[PDB]
Amino acid sequence: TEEQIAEFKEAFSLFDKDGDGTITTKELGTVMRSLGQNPTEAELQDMINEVDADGNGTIDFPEFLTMMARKMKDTDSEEEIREAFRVFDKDGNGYISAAELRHVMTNLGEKLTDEEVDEMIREADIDGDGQVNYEEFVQMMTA
């Protein structure tokens, strides 16, 4: 809808600092610093490689619209998240305990707070018995 288009245009404008019709690496680094995460030159190179496709060194508004308009039903990340779980599936049956999920969530990689990981576990398990099936955990929302 037009309201979401206006919201995305405002998001792009906030992304833009000098106002050259596009977003440069320095603007993304500055907003990341404002958030609290200090950027890296390799991180910005990855940013540019991931976002832009025509090879211009900047991020455009239509590119951001295409990026953010893809949901988990269009990301083709079903098998990807399946494999992400499977790497941690020591037994391979397809179950992981809640404590192990909390540990991996809040200790390794992009750590989060306790509340967010508990919410993740609750949403993953409709039954909420502490046992997570990755099939469902990637198929009832991520598919």
Beta carbon nearer to another protein, 26 or 111 = 111
Task: Identify the burial level of 55 via C-beta atoms within 10 angstroms of its C-beta, where 0-12 means exposed, 13-18 middle and 19 or more buried.
Answer: exposed
134 is in an annotated binding site: no
114 is in an annotated binding site: no
Beta carbon nearer to another protein, 67 or 99 = 67
Closest CB 31 distance from another protein, rounded Å: 7
Closest CB 121 distance from another protein, rounded Å: 10
Closest CB 89 distance from another protein, rounded Å: 10
Beta carbon nearer to another protein, 36 or 62 = 36
129 is in an annotated binding site: yes
Do 134 and 82 contact (CB within 8 A), yes or no? yes
Closest CB 138 distance from another protein, rounded Å: 8
Question: What residue numbers does the annotated binding site for Ca(2+) cover?
Answer: 16, 18, 20, 22, 27, 52, 54, 56, 58, 63, 89, 91, 93, 95, 100, 125, 127, 129, 131, 136
